[PDB]
Amino acid sequence: MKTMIYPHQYNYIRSVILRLKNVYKTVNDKETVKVIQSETYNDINEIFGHIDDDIEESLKVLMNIRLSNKEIEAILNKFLEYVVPFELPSPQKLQKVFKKVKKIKIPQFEEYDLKVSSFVGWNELASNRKYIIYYDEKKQLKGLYGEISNQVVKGFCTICNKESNVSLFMKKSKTQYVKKGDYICRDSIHCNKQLTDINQFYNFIDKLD
Ligand SMILES: [Zn+2]
């Protein structure tokens, strides 16, 4: 029985681990490393809740300044076992959240894209739409769509906060109607992988009104 974590928590862990590796490689001052080892150790400690033997050992390995890439890959592979993947809704539910969209169907998904996903977004060309589904803080299924512009620009995604290939996403409020939004990753799978803080996603959702 492994304690359960969210995909974004996994992504955050992957994130701090790679950063730690970089600190081991490129930073000299010993005390800065100690503060960082301890912080990272705490961040992971804080996410999991309780240490089980695998987590204690992974941490022991992470805490070695001689940490290797192969070791990282083993640790990441193990942390993944703790993640509760995004749950795709049934077609009948998907259809009920997009009541006015006749002829809608989720595109095929990799379960392991799903282990890093906080939300699901896919683009439909004829419509110039990106559809997004997610579960809110109450775990209820929600869905929306918006216009995603053709132009790709190199910029920080409003959702994942990473410098990426982004496009302007605009949502029409209930209808004479209003249009709101901002730049987000054109490729939402990649977006989900970079998303380490789900509040940013929910904040993006709130700004769309
Ligand atoms: Zn993004």
mmCIF file of C-alpha atoms and ligand atoms in Angstrom:
data_model
loop_
_atom_site.group_PDB
_atom_site.id
_atom_site.type_symbol
_atom_site.label_atom_id
_atom_site.label_comp_id
_atom_site.label_asym_id
_atom_site.label_seq_id
_atom_site.Cartn_x
_atom_site.Cartn_y
_atom_site.Cartn_z
ATOM 1 C CA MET A 1 0.000 0.000 0.000
ATOM 2 C CA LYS A 2 1.703 3.193 -1.248
ATOM 3 C CA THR A 3 0.680 6.493 -0.252
ATOM 4 C CA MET A 4 -1.077 8.236 -3.171
ATOM 5 C CA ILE A 5 0.200 11.385 -4.909
ATOM 6 C CA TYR A 6 -1.064 13.553 -7.733
ATOM 7 C CA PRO A 7 0.622 13.742 -11.154
ATOM 8 C CA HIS A 8 1.621 17.360 -10.600
ATOM 9 C CA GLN A 9 3.310 16.277 -7.375
ATOM 10 C CA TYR A 10 5.211 13.711 -9.286
ATOM 11 C CA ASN A 11 6.187 16.349 -11.852
ATOM 12 C CA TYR A 12 7.346 18.598 -9.012
ATOM 13 C CA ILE A 13 9.448 15.806 -7.580
ATOM 14 C CA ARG A 14 11.012 15.027 -10.983
ATOM 15 C CA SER A 15 11.681 18.716 -11.223
ATOM 16 C CA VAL A 16 13.534 19.176 -7.928
ATOM 17 C CA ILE A 17 15.487 15.994 -8.455
ATOM 18 C CA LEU A 18 16.884 17.237 -11.787
ATOM 19 C CA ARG A 19 17.667 20.571 -10.219
ATOM 20 C CA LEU A 20 19.464 18.783 -7.345
ATOM 21 C CA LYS A 21 21.477 16.899 -9.810
ATOM 22 C CA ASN A 22 22.466 20.171 -11.377
ATOM 23 C CA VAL A 23 23.447 21.629 -8.038
ATOM 24 C CA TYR A 24 25.656 18.596 -7.369
ATOM 25 C CA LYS A 25 27.312 19.049 -10.721
ATOM 26 C CA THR A 26 27.942 22.796 -10.810
ATOM 27 C CA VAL A 27 27.894 24.236 -7.294
ATOM 28 C CA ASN A 28 30.865 24.418 -5.013
ATOM 29 C CA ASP A 29 29.979 26.015 -1.723
ATOM 30 C CA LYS A 30 29.189 23.109 0.640
ATOM 31 C CA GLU A 31 26.676 24.875 2.853
ATOM 32 C CA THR A 32 24.483 25.954 -0.110
ATOM 33 C CA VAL A 33 24.396 22.287 -1.145
ATOM 34 C CA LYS A 34 23.359 21.275 2.410
ATOM 35 C CA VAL A 35 20.528 23.775 2.500
ATOM 36 C CA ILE A 36 19.392 22.467 -0.858
ATOM 37 C CA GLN A 37 19.745 18.773 -0.052
ATOM 38 C CA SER A 38 17.702 19.376 3.091
ATOM 39 C CA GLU A 39 15.081 21.473 1.270
ATOM 40 C CA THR A 40 14.703 18.855 -1.492
ATOM 41 C CA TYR A 41 14.675 16.103 1.084
ATOM 42 C CA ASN A 42 11.890 18.082 2.850
ATOM 43 C CA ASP A 43 9.902 18.795 -0.315
ATOM 44 C CA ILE A 44 9.799 15.092 -1.127
ATOM 45 C CA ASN A 45 9.268 14.297 2.568
ATOM 46 C CA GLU A 46 6.430 16.755 2.607
ATOM 47 C CA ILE A 47 4.769 15.440 -0.511
ATOM 48 C CA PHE A 48 4.747 11.817 0.441
ATOM 49 C CA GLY A 49 3.625 12.119 4.007
ATOM 50 C CA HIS A 50 5.304 9.097 5.365
ATOM 51 C CA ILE A 51 8.569 7.561 4.391
ATOM 52 C CA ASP A 52 8.321 3.898 3.450
ATOM 53 C CA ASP A 53 11.480 1.890 2.790
ATOM 54 C CA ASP A 54 11.613 2.700 -0.924
ATOM 55 C CA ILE A 55 11.310 6.387 -0.322
ATOM 56 C CA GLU A 56 13.892 6.336 2.439
ATOM 57 C CA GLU A 57 16.341 4.510 0.183
ATOM 58 C CA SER A 58 15.644 6.687 -2.854
ATOM 59 C CA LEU A 59 16.295 9.718 -0.643
ATOM 60 C CA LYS A 60 19.435 8.161 0.667
ATOM 61 C CA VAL A 61 20.557 7.742 -2.949
ATOM 62 C CA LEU A 62 19.415 11.295 -3.905
ATOM 63 C CA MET A 63 21.341 12.621 -0.947
ATOM 64 C CA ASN A 64 24.565 11.330 -2.375
ATOM 65 C CA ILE A 65 26.495 13.979 -4.140
ATOM 66 C CA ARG A 66 27.684 11.108 -6.364
ATOM 67 C CA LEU A 67 24.090 10.700 -7.613
ATOM 68 C CA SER A 68 24.038 9.325 -11.141
ATOM 69 C CA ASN A 69 21.635 9.589 -14.074
ATOM 70 C CA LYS A 70 20.901 5.859 -13.966
ATOM 71 C CA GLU A 71 19.951 6.196 -10.324
ATOM 72 C CA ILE A 72 17.637 9.125 -11.134
ATOM 73 C CA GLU A 73 15.879 7.070 -13.734
ATOM 74 C CA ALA A 74 15.367 4.210 -11.223
ATOM 75 C CA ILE A 75 14.052 6.623 -8.609
ATOM 76 C CA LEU A 76 11.701 8.370 -11.003
ATOM 77 C CA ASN A 77 10.428 4.985 -12.179
ATOM 78 C CA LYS A 78 9.699 4.055 -8.536
ATOM 79 C CA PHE A 79 8.070 7.376 -7.621
ATOM 80 C CA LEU A 80 5.724 6.834 -10.558
ATOM 81 C CA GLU A 81 4.220 3.814 -8.781
ATOM 82 C CA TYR A 82 2.789 6.189 -6.176
ATOM 83 C CA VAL A 83 0.938 8.364 -8.690
ATOM 84 C CA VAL A 84 -2.805 8.209 -9.152
ATOM 85 C CA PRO A 85 -3.384 8.791 -12.857
ATOM 86 C CA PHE A 86 -5.878 11.124 -14.438
ATOM 87 C CA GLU A 87 -9.165 9.354 -14.959
ATOM 88 C CA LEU A 88 -10.684 9.659 -18.411
ATOM 89 C CA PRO A 89 -14.468 10.150 -18.259
ATOM 90 C CA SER A 90 -16.871 7.838 -20.061
ATOM 91 C CA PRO A 91 -18.106 9.045 -23.465
ATOM 92 C CA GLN A 92 -21.543 9.547 -22.075
ATOM 93 C CA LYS A 93 -20.049 11.828 -19.384
ATOM 94 C CA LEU A 94 -17.764 13.533 -21.799
ATOM 95 C CA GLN A 95 -20.764 14.241 -23.998
ATOM 96 C CA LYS A 96 -22.772 15.559 -21.047
ATOM 97 C CA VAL A 97 -20.084 18.140 -20.155
ATOM 98 C CA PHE A 98 -20.001 19.309 -23.794
ATOM 99 C CA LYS A 99 -23.774 19.148 -24.316
ATOM 100 C CA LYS A 100 -23.847 21.421 -27.346
ATOM 101 C CA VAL A 101 -21.010 19.719 -29.123
ATOM 102 C CA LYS A 102 -22.435 16.951 -31.194
ATOM 103 C CA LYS A 103 -19.900 14.552 -32.413
ATOM 104 C CA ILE A 104 -17.231 14.847 -29.727
ATOM 105 C CA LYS A 105 -14.777 12.212 -28.686
ATOM 106 C CA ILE A 106 -11.531 12.204 -26.758
ATOM 107 C CA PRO A 107 -8.516 11.366 -28.867
ATOM 108 C CA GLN A 108 -6.504 8.328 -27.998
ATOM 109 C CA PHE A 109 -4.363 8.607 -24.824
ATOM 110 C CA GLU A 110 -1.270 6.957 -23.424
ATOM 111 C CA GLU A 111 -1.900 5.790 -19.847
ATOM 112 C CA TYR A 112 1.560 7.146 -19.139
ATOM 113 C CA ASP A 113 0.797 10.501 -20.580
ATOM 114 C CA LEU A 114 -2.083 10.187 -18.133
ATOM 115 C CA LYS A 115 0.218 9.587 -15.144
ATOM 116 C CA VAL A 116 1.655 13.097 -15.628
ATOM 117 C CA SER A 117 -1.654 14.798 -16.466
ATOM 118 C CA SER A 118 -3.589 17.259 -14.344
ATOM 119 C CA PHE A 119 -5.897 18.116 -17.209
ATOM 120 C CA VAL A 120 -6.525 16.878 -20.754
ATOM 121 C CA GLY A 121 -6.398 19.174 -23.763
ATOM 122 C CA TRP A 122 -6.619 18.375 -27.430
ATOM 123 C CA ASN A 123 -6.793 20.408 -30.585
ATOM 124 C CA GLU A 124 -9.400 20.157 -33.289
ATOM 125 C CA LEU A 125 -8.353 21.793 -36.576
ATOM 126 C CA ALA A 126 -11.507 22.587 -38.507
ATOM 127 C CA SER A 127 -12.805 24.305 -35.360
ATOM 128 C CA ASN A 128 -9.541 25.939 -34.305
ATOM 129 C CA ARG A 129 -10.487 24.775 -30.830
ATOM 130 C CA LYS A 130 -8.595 23.410 -27.932
ATOM 131 C CA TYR A 131 -10.743 21.370 -25.593
ATOM 132 C CA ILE A 132 -9.742 21.059 -21.960
ATOM 133 C CA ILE A 133 -11.191 18.695 -19.348
ATOM 134 C CA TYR A 134 -10.139 18.470 -15.762
ATOM 135 C CA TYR A 135 -11.557 17.764 -12.289
ATOM 136 C CA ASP A 136 -12.112 20.709 -10.032
ATOM 137 C CA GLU A 137 -11.212 20.800 -6.364
ATOM 138 C CA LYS A 138 -14.417 18.968 -5.668
ATOM 139 C CA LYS A 139 -13.416 16.251 -8.051
ATOM 140 C CA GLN A 140 -16.283 16.994 -10.438
ATOM 141 C CA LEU A 141 -15.615 16.677 -14.139
ATOM 142 C CA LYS A 142 -15.488 19.972 -15.983
ATOM 143 C CA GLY A 143 -14.844 20.826 -19.582
ATOM 144 C CA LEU A 144 -14.415 23.887 -21.711
ATOM 145 C CA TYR A 145 -13.141 24.813 -25.143
ATOM 146 C CA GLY A 146 -11.671 27.912 -26.726
ATOM 147 C CA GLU A 147 -10.080 29.242 -29.826
ATOM 148 C CA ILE A 148 -6.397 28.561 -30.106
ATOM 149 C CA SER A 149 -4.596 30.714 -32.551
ATOM 150 C CA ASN A 150 -2.489 29.328 -35.384
ATOM 151 C CA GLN A 151 0.554 31.372 -34.657
ATOM 152 C CA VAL A 152 3.189 29.777 -32.449
ATOM 153 C CA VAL A 153 5.362 31.979 -30.308
ATOM 154 C CA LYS A 154 8.175 31.261 -27.919
ATOM 155 C CA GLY A 155 7.064 32.304 -24.487
ATOM 156 C CA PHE A 156 6.046 31.366 -20.998
ATOM 157 C CA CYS A 157 2.942 29.227 -20.823
ATOM 158 C CA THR A 158 0.261 30.766 -18.516
ATOM 159 C CA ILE A 159 -0.690 27.281 -17.253
ATOM 160 C CA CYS A 160 2.591 25.521 -16.616
ATOM 161 C CA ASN A 161 4.719 28.647 -16.292
ATOM 162 C CA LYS A 162 7.435 27.240 -18.592
ATOM 163 C CA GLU A 163 9.048 28.803 -21.646
ATOM 164 C CA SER A 164 7.460 26.806 -24.448
ATOM 165 C CA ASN A 165 5.829 26.849 -27.805
ATOM 166 C CA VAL A 166 2.678 28.753 -26.935
ATOM 167 C CA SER A 167 -0.437 30.080 -28.606
ATOM 168 C CA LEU A 168 -3.122 32.573 -27.642
ATOM 169 C CA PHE A 169 -6.111 30.719 -26.174
ATOM 170 C CA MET A 170 -9.469 32.635 -26.083
ATOM 171 C CA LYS A 171 -12.693 31.460 -24.449
ATOM 172 C CA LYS A 172 -16.128 32.906 -25.268
ATOM 173 C CA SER A 173 -18.198 33.515 -22.130
ATOM 174 C CA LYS A 174 -21.883 32.789 -22.195
ATOM 175 C CA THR A 175 -23.623 34.735 -24.908
ATOM 176 C CA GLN A 176 -23.455 39.498 -27.962
ATOM 177 C CA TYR A 177 -20.675 37.758 -25.902
ATOM 178 C CA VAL A 178 -17.231 38.196 -24.163
ATOM 179 C CA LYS A 179 -13.804 36.722 -25.029
ATOM 180 C CA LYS A 180 -11.015 36.089 -22.467
ATOM 181 C CA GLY A 181 -7.760 34.157 -22.193
ATOM 182 C CA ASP A 182 -3.978 34.116 -22.570
ATOM 183 C CA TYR A 183 -1.029 32.200 -24.075
ATOM 184 C CA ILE A 184 -0.700 28.486 -23.302
ATOM 185 C CA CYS A 185 1.246 25.527 -24.693
ATOM 186 C CA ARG A 186 -0.069 24.498 -28.049
ATOM 187 C CA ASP A 187 0.777 20.884 -27.085
ATOM 188 C CA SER A 188 -1.133 20.152 -23.825
ATOM 189 C CA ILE A 189 0.521 16.789 -23.154
ATOM 190 C CA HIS A 190 3.829 18.484 -22.947
ATOM 191 C CA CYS A 191 2.170 21.243 -20.915
ATOM 192 C CA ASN A 192 0.960 18.675 -18.341
ATOM 193 C CA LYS A 193 4.474 17.258 -18.052
ATOM 194 C CA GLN A 194 5.851 20.696 -17.184
ATOM 195 C CA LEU A 195 3.084 21.478 -14.720
ATOM 196 C CA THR A 196 4.360 21.164 -11.185
ATOM 197 C CA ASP A 197 1.736 23.384 -9.442
ATOM 198 C CA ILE A 198 -1.953 22.772 -10.107
ATOM 199 C CA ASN A 199 -2.954 26.136 -8.647
ATOM 200 C CA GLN A 200 -1.615 27.771 -11.747
ATOM 201 C CA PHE A 201 -3.906 25.692 -13.872
ATOM 202 C CA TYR A 202 -6.886 26.541 -11.625
ATOM 203 C CA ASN A 203 -5.893 30.218 -11.709
ATOM 204 C CA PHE A 204 -5.763 30.128 -15.489
ATOM 205 C CA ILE A 205 -9.281 28.594 -15.360
ATOM 206 C CA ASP A 206 -10.497 31.314 -13.023
ATOM 207 C CA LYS A 207 -9.247 34.141 -15.236
ATOM 208 C CA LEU A 208 -11.278 32.802 -18.179
ATOM 209 C CA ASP A 209 -14.422 33.706 -16.189
HETATM 210 ZN ZN ZN B 1 2.136 24.845 -20.608
#
